[PDB]
Ligand binder design. Structure first.
Ligand SMILES: CC(=O)N[C@@H]1[C@@H](O[C@H](C)C(=O)N[C@@H](C)C(=O)N[C@H](CCC(=O)O)C(N)=O)[C@H](O)[C@@H](CO)O[C@H]1O
Ligand SMILES: [Cl-]
Ligand SMILES: [Cl-]
Ligand SMILES: [Cl-]
Ligand SMILES: [Cl-]
Ligand SMILES: [Cl-]
Ligand SMILES: [Cl-]
Ligand SMILES: [Cl-]
Length: 222
């Protein structure tokens, strides 16, 4: 069976509302727990969130660096975002947009990485535990993978997204966030607006460069 439609919307909502399941929302400058009604509203299907991001797009290094101009630690790293796109077959507009949301347009202090020994570790995609503490103990995905440079963190993030999400039939933002095939497991983030934020930047970049959209899917539930 290639049939990944497993749950009704109501069944999925109740699972997303389950015990100790971290769903969060930005209010008054920081993240708080989302209520059950906010969760249900967020997972409701309304198209960048629903677009397959497992294909390459024809963006040159010049075009990618345009997008990255004024983006902090990510500025003038378009060549490496493209190396990631071609190596791992990950949409570069998606990849850039995801990094921009997570790193605060490349300007956040956490985007400048975490020191340990003579190395510093970088993480631009919110992958695993990434804080002072976790790097110390070695319970950090970034350290395990030795993302010792920004370029390694770009390539490594794409490798992770491809191998852990795209190869797990989570092919667009909605599936990455809400995993309708298996609700409330293997979800990329706790922010209920995670997909919205990335999708917004993707859509701007699609309309800036006139890029053609890949497949859209809006059917996920019984
Ligand atoms: C991309 C990422 O890290 N999103 C984590 C998410 O973990 C997902 C499922 C994951 O893909 N985790 C990766 C790092 C890993 O491949 N799976 C688990 C790590 C579990 C974790 O991050 O806590 C493992 N192999 O041991 C975790 O559930 C949630 C609440 O803690 O906080 C999100 O920010
Ligand atoms: Cl959780
Ligand atoms: Cl070019
Ligand atoms: Cl993220
Ligand atoms: Cl969403
Ligand atoms: Cl338009
Ligand atoms: Cl389509
Ligand atoms: Cl549906």
């Amino acid at each position: 069976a290639a049939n990944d439609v497993n749950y009704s919307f109501d069944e999925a909502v109740s699972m997303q509302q389950g015990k100790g399941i971290v769903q969060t929302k930005e209010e008054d400058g920081k993240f708080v727990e989302a209520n059950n009604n906010e969760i249900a509203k967020a997972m409701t299907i309304s198209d960048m969130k629903y677009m397959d991001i497992t294909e390459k797009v024809p963006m040159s290094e010049s075009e990618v660096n345009q997008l990255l101009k004024g983006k902090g630690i990510l500025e003038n790293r378009g060549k490496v975002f493209l190396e990631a796109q071609e190596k791992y077959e990950v949409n570069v507009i998606y990849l850039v947009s995801h990094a921009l949301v997570e790193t605060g347009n490349g300007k956040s202090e956490l985007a400048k990485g975490i020191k340990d020994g003579k190395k510093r570790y970088y993480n631009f995609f919110g992958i695993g535990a990434f804080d002072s503490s976790a790097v110390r103990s070695g319970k950090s995905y970034a350290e395990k993978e030795q993302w010792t440079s920004p370029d390694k963190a770009i390539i490594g993030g794409a490798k992770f997204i491809r191998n852990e999400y795209f190869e797990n039939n989570q092919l667009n933002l909605y599936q990455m966030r809400w995993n309708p095939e298996n609700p409330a497991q293997h979800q990329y983030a706790s922010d209920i607006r995670w997909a919205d934020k990335i999708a917004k930047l993707m859509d701007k970049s699609y309309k800036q460069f006139g890029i053609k959209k890949d497949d859209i899917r809006q059917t996920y539930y019984k």
